[PDB]
């Protein structure tokens, strides 16, 4: 004859924490983001 | 005995080609020599200075040791 | 004159020396005239984790008539390596040429 599922808990966790409010958490985020984008 | 006779006998025929002097003029007319191998050198005196070519530099390994 | 080039070692001081020879030497003597010094180091390291690879090379010939002085230095600076980035390296080279009394100008 003739769709991406996301996680509620992990999304809430990663939205809860903020970078960018100071240089310390910003630099931690930068270092992790560099290595994570690489590998 | 046979070999050193036949090789010289063939050399007599093969060396006796026609003209035989225009190619002397053709070879000697290029008094600029064959192009010689390039090296990095100093401008004033031409002593060689070290190169960083990748196909040679990729084999090199060094280490660090304490001094006495 | 082979007894002049047999000497005690000293073993190690950091630098290396080679003698430098000319194409036409004197008739009844040895042809070597100058000395080339070579040094190589890695200064700003913490505990063998280095910073700034560095090396230097100087050729010197001094007598009462002429003076030859050539020199070269290289400094390498590494910005990133994987997985912290891509491999990103810069290099600075300097060189100088002095040849008295033939030229009376120096080359940089
Ligand atoms: Mg020299």
From Swiss-Prot, chain A:
Q: Where in the cell is it found?
A: Plastid, Chloroplast membrane
The protein's job, in short, is: Essential for cell growth. May be involved in binding chloroplast DNA to either the chloroplast envelope or the thylakoid membrane.
The entry's family comment says: Belongs to the ycf78 family.
Query: In its UniProt entry, what is this protein called?
Result: Uncharacterized membrane protein ycf78
Gene source species:
Chlamydomonas reinhardtii
Give the fragment's position in the full-length protein: 585 to 633 of 1995
